[PDB]
Structures are given as structure tokens and as C-alpha cells.
Symmetry: C6
Subunit: 180 residues, 6 copies
């Protein structure tokens, strides 16, 4: 069977509580289910992620998908849950080796072309990821904001193809710009 456990961060107040996106593909009819108290802003990432995956020259599963963005108590608010979901889908469809996601935290928003967009309130997530020793991968638009941290384990990408190539083969991504 195939299931993937991607990591990310959700901000509640000042602390970015860890969140564990958990995709799981079944053999039933091609539905799409999201649980874990997903707010409307994050409950509509279904079609957005579908388009961002199809447009990046990938195979979007024709299978019963079931995302589980939850510790079931915490409601999810931000819009940065598209990159974790897309990478979880790809990893659970065997298009990405699941061992690449060992210790990475992904935060990003996907357009309909696969291009990544900048989420808001990124600093708490970067601080939490640094404190947890995890690698963080964010959209280019947040590179300027996260440059202050000066943490050497943060990478920024332009689109989903960049992140997929980095995970599968490690093409160096883009690092973060120098501290101001």
C-alpha cells in the first residue's frame, strides 16, 4: 500500500504548532476528502493542488484521495497547506521516493501553473523549524522575509518542479538571500 506523511507548520498565535499532512490513496472511485478541521481557505486546496500537479507534468492519481491535515483538535487556517499536500500526493503515488521527505518541512502555496506563492506570517514557522533541526522549503516570495533569520538550512523554490527535482535528485534549490 501507499501512504505519505509530510510535515508542515500551522501558526496559532505566536507559536507555529507542527502539523502532519497525511495523504492516503484508496482504490475506490476518484473522490477527494479532507479532514482535521480544515477551514474553507484550506478546504478548497483540492482543485488548486490538482491543477498544480497536472500542470507540472505529473500523474495526478485517479484514485480515492484522503488528506488528514490534523491533530484532530487544531483547526487549520493558513493557505500554505498546498505544497505539503502536493508532495504527499506525489510521494504516496510513488512519483517521489518517500525517503526524501525524512526531515523536511514544506510551507508554500501553489498557483494553477505549479508556481509557488508567498504565504504570510512565515517567521514563526522558520524559527520553529530551526529549533526542530528540520530543513525548511518555502516559496521565493518569502525569501526576503526569511532572510533575517539567517538560518543556513532554509531553501526557496520557484515552482513545484524545482522542489520535486531537489527532493528526487538534489539540484541545490535556491538558498536564502544574505542578511540585511
Amino acid at each position: 500500500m501507499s501512504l505519505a506523511f509530510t510535515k508542515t507548520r500551522s501558526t496559532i498565535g505566536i507559536v507555529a504548532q507542527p502539523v502532519s499532512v497525511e495523504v492516503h490513496l484508496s482504490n475506490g472511485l476518484p473522490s477527494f476528502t479532507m479532514v482535521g478541521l480544515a477551514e474553507t481557505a484550506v478546504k478548497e486546496s483540492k482543485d488548486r493542488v490538482r491543477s498544480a500537479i497536472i500542470n507540472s507534468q505529473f500523474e495526478f492519481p485517479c484514485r480515492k484521495i484522503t488528506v488528514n491535515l490534523g491533530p484532530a483538535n487544531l483547526p487549520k487556517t493558513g493557505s500554505g497547506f498546498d505544497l505539503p499536500i502536493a508532495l504527499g500526493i506525489l510521494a504516496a503515488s510513488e512519483q517521489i521516493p518517500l525517503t526524501n521527505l525524512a526531515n523536511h518541512e514544506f510551507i508554500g502555496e501553489l498557483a494553477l501553473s505549479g508556481e509557488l506563492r508567498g504565504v504570510s506570517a512565515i517567521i514563526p514557522a522558520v524559527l520553529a523549524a530551526h529549533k526542530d533541526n528540520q530543513h525548511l522549503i518555502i516559496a521565493n516570495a518569502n525569501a526576503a522575509e526569511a532572510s533575517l533569520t539567517g538560518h543556513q538550512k532554509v531553501f526557496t523554490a520557484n515552482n513545484l518542479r524545482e522542489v520535486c527535482d531537489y527532493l528526487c535528485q538534489g539540484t541545490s534549490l535556491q538558498s536564502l538571500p544574505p542578511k540585511p
Copy 2:
């Protein structure tokens, strides 16, 4: 490809936050998903855009239509998203050459005849468009309001066919009144 990008502006308060209308025509059955936090454009812009496209002697895709409006975490209020969405559908269906959509914004609401009615609070959009060096193509009913600025590279249109010809061809569209 079947992916098109368009630009418009949503007015919250006094600022006109740029919006990125993204249309992606998939291969499934007829659908018109409109992700992005639209309130009254959700289920109303669909039918107006469909009828305006059909009545202007255009092919309406018999596919799964996914429309994603600008930033995900930004409620979108006005009714002027019919022209950007219609042009995005036409571009994604190749009925318009999308290589000429880069420098132009679009604002307006479409009737069922393909005619362009006048949206409210338009001058902020003109200011923003000129600041960014973009052509702003608005409905004829807002020509009076747009003429105050006298900004060059701004235009106004009677119906959707006028704009589609101004893009496919290069016919001068309407210009603006000199300064009534």
C-alpha cells in the same frame, strides 16, 4: 496548453489589491470550480460569463473549468471579475492568443448579451494600473470616470467582442474622452 493567466484588481477599502485570475481547462466533465474566497462572484459570474461568451460567437469549453482568483487568503468582493474570467477562458481555449495578455489588465461585468456594464470604484484601479505600466481595458459605462485621469494606454470597450478583436487584432478600441 489549456492554462491561461489574467490580471485584475479587487478594491478593499481604498486600495486595489492586485488579483491573478488563473483558468485551467482540464479534460473531465463540465465543471466551473471557482476556488479563491469569492462571495457573490462564486455562482453568479459562472452563468454570466458562460452566456456572454456564447452570445459573442465564441466556443465555450465543454471541459472541467477551474478558476483560481489571486491570493487564496483574500476575500474577493466586486462583480468586475466577469471580463477577466471570460478572457481567461478564451485564452485557455486558444480562441485568443495569450501572448498578448501580459501587459493588460481587465475590469468589468458582462451582461447576457456580451455587453459590458460599469462596475463601481474604478479610478483606484486606473491609478494602480498606470503605476504598474499596464493597459487597463474597462467597460464603456466607466469612460466618464476613467477620463478624469486622461492616462494614456487606457481603453474602454462596449462589449466582449470589441476587446477580443482589440487583442486578436490591434484595432484601436475606444480610447477615452479628451477631458469632458
Copy 3:
């Protein structure tokens, strides 16, 4: 094509905003879609219009109906939108020549037999139609209330067949009784 426009009024407070009912018949399956922020009272006019057209010895289209009500950002409240919509459907289905609907403004709801019924707050609509020099056609029940103002160029009908006859061949259509 199968596309007809009608005019009516929407009374809020002391001002009767102009509303342009727009009807389009497409080739899809049977359906009836309203647009323009129509409230429950307005949005429930579908069945009333259907039965009023059917019982008046007219032909109700089997096509997909699509009614767009005037400005897309103005909620519609009154119940007098049944007559404009019925006339729009008949005009779009070629049952009526649509040149007659040029300068007239129609108000008044429809019973299930095709007979017209009165609607509250009719004086502002009469005033607005007077300022625009538009032939107003209202339900016969509203004659006893409108005629007190002694305003001419306003005609009152009892059933949809009467209005259709007046538009097709100018068969009188009664008139507001003397001020008495």
C-alpha cells in the same frame, strides 16, 4: 439568438433602482438558473413563472433558462419580478416580438393561473418610470392605488394574456381609472 432583455424596478426605501432582466435560453438540459443576488421571494419565482406561462396557453421552453437580474451587486427584494421574467422568457422563445419591450417597464407578480397580482410600494416605481418617460405596466390590483396620483401613460392588466395582446397588437390594456 434566444436572448431577450426586459426592464423593471426594485424599490428600496424611497428610490426605485432600475433593473434589467436578462434571459438566455441555451441548448443544455432543462434547468432554471437565476443570477444577481435574488432573495428567496425573487428566486422562488421560477415555478410561478412556469405555471403562469403554461396556463396562459403559451409555450414554456424545454431549453436551459438563465435569468440575470439587472446589476450584479444589487440584491433584489420585491415580488414583482415574475412579470418581467415571464415576458423575457416569451420574447427569448420568439413567442413575442421583442421590439415591443423596448421602452416599457413591467411590474407585478404572477398568480399560478397567469392572473397578475398587486405588489406593495408601487408609487416609487411609478415616479421613477415617469421621470424616464417609460410606459409602466402593472397588475390590475395596483390600479386603485396608482390612479390616485392621476398619472397617465400607465396601463394595468389582469392576466399575462392581456399584456401579451397589448404588446403584440396594442389591444388597449385598460388604463388607470380617473383619480376619484
Copy 4:
């Protein structure tokens, strides 16, 4: 044709406004639509009346029933709309001659088996039916409250077949208020 115009009264505040319950059996698949701002306590009248009409040895049409009860903009709120709706449905089915509902106002809900039940706030309906010159009909349970007025033309009954007889062949409901 298939149409019927029953009558009843709706009580808001102290006054009881006239409410013309109307029916139209259109050709098509089985269906049932209750137009006219009907609240839930009226919207279950669908099943209530269907069961009453199949438990009173009557025929329930297999046609697209369309029960409109206006004035449309009046928020019907009571629950004694089952009897007028059932009578109108029967009349539109040519089971009850429609020449008998000319001067009869009906009130009182229907039990699942056919027996009429008592609705609250009946006195204002009695007062209005007195100030219209109508044969007001109520459930037997309301005889105690109708007696206080002592008015005539206030016949009452226990089940549907009692009131169907008072209309078709067998007159003399013979349940006038106990005391003048």
C-alpha cells in the same frame, strides 16, 4: 386544465390576512414544490397531505404538483395549511368539483390518517371570515374556541371525507359551534 384555487387565512399578530392556496398539476416526473415563503411547519404539509389523501380513500396525482400559496412576499408561518392544500390538490385532480370552493375558507391541520386537528389562534380567523362572508371551516377540536364567538357559518368536521362530502354531495357538516 388542472388548476384549483383554495382559500385560507394566515395569522400574524392580531390580523389574519387572506392566503389563496393554489395548485397546478404539470406533466412530468413526480414532484412537489411549495412556493411562497412557506416555513418548515408548512413545508411538511407535503408528506402530511399525501398521506392524508392516500388514507382518505382518494387518488394522489403522479404529476408535478406545484402548490403556490401567496401573496408571495407574505411569510406563511401557521400549520393549518394542510386542509386547503389537500382540497386544492383534489380539485385540480377533478375529484372535488371546483364550483364548491367558491365561498369556503378552510383551516385545520390533517393527521396522518385523515383526521383534522386543532390549530392555535383561531379566533382572528373567525373574525376575518365573519368580515368577508365566507363559509369558514375548522377542525372539530376548535369548536370549543369557536363557540365563544357564537358566529354562524363556522361548520366543523373531524376527517377529510367529512369535508369532501360537504362539498361534493353530502352537505350538513352539522358541527356548528355548540353555543351561540
Copy 5:
């Protein structure tokens, strides 16, 4: 005829209002419809009744059930409507002699297996049953609370099959153990 009039008591304020649970069984496709102001806790009772009936080695009809618990204007907020509904459905499909429900008031919910459970605020129901001289039947768990009154004629049971046998044959379920 597949009809059954069971009875129960609804408690609002201090008085236990009478409730007449009425069940019909049409000849259509399988369905289920609860009529009246059935609150959430009541309308979920459909599956509870179905499971309790199936597990008790009874026969669940494959018909278009239609449960109506009047009056239609009194909210049914309690949860002890499960047992009366199950008994009515059984009696409708010639599974319980209808006559045996002559003067019995049933209160208490069910589980999937059919075992009865206690309900809150039982004393007023017993007081009303004594006043109206009905053979009240309550859940076994409610026996302890229904002792302070000390009224006779009140029976208790744990399984729905016990009540079915008592109604069909008569087995003296229990005797409401006395108090000092």
C-alpha cells in the same frame, strides 16, 4: 391499511404534552421521512429504529416509511421517541396487534441491539400518564426514578422484544419496584 397510531409524551416546561406518533407505509422505493418539528436528536432516530428492529429478529419494511408525530407546532426536543416509533412501524407491518396499543404510552430510546435506555425528566410523564390513566411503559433504567411517585400501572423493561411480547401475549414486564 399499513397505518399505526402510537402515543408518547413530550415534556416542555413542566407539563408532559401528549404526542401521537403516526406511521404510514407507502408502496414506493425505500426511504424514510420524519414529519413535524423533529429536532436533531429525534431525526437521527431513523437508523436507531432500523437497527433495533433488525437486531430484535423482527422484519423491517422495504417500503416508503412516513413517520409523523403531531402536533406540527410543538417542538419534539426529547429523545424518548425511539420506542414509540419502533412500535408504530412494527404495528403498521402486521407485526404487533394494533388493538393492544389502545391505552399505552411508550417512553425510552433504543440501542442498535434493541435494549432500552433511560431518559431525563421522566416524572412529569408518569404524572400525566396517571392523570390520563394510560399504561405507561418506561425503560428499565428509568425504574428507579419512577418510584418516588409510587404510582401503579407503570411497567419497565430492558429489551424491545420484552415489550413486543408483552403487547402481543402479555408477560408482565416488571412492576416498578416499590419505595419505603
Copy 6:
């Protein structure tokens, strides 16, 4: 037959009322019904439990599931109802002997891999289970919180297979950490 009961606790106020979980597998089409006053956080457990059962190398019933968690008046508002539901489903589908669950109480949510996660406020459940003398089984993440009571019979586990072996085979494992 295919009916299985499981026990758990819901914290309402300061007390942990028992919540009997009941699972019924009918013969109809594949479905899933959660009867009882279950909030979104609880009725979103269908997908979680299905995925946890499938991914643990178990068999998920291809039947009309019907989950009831009584009483039908307590607003079940916890987040650790997934483990009792999964255990009940497995027992109902003759996958776990039903005699094992006769004395144990279960708590803890599930992931899409079957691993158990830590619910909030486990202490009241431990206190109530000790008072009633039931073997409480909780997720490993709650071991630290459950250690500060000193009560034995608080065995823990990491995934569904662990608890299944604990019941089926008897591989008792894990326990409260010493007594800090």
C-alpha cells in the same frame, strides 16, 4: 449477529460520562452513518477509521456500516473516538473476538497509518476508569500525562495492531511510566 459494542469516555464538565459505542453492519450498499449528537470533529472520523483499518493490514467491511455512540443526548465532543470506532468495526466484522472488549475501555485518535495519537485531557478518563475498574487503553502519547495518577490498568499502545494483539493474542505491552 454483526453488532459489536465498545466503551469509551467523554469529558463533559469535569466528569467523564461513559459513552457506549455501537456498530452495526447491515446488508445494503456501502455507507457510513454516525448516529448520535456527534460534532464535526467526531463525524469526520469516518475517513480516519477507514484508512487506519485498511493500512493496518485488516479488512474493512464492504457493507452498510451504521455507527451509534449513545446516549443520544450527550453532545459527543471528544477527539479520541477513532480507536473505539475502529475496534467496534473490527469486532462487528468478526475480526476481534467480542469477549475481549467486555471489560476494557478505549481512548485515542488514529492516523492514516494506524498509529495512535494523544488526545487532550486524559486524566478524567483515567480517574473514571479506575473508579469503575475497567482496563483503560490509551495512546502512547498520553503515557506521560497518565503516569501522574499511580493507577495501574492504564496500558498503552502505539498503533492499532498493538491493541489488536493485546486483545486477540494477549501480547500485553507498555504501561504507565514509573511514578514521577
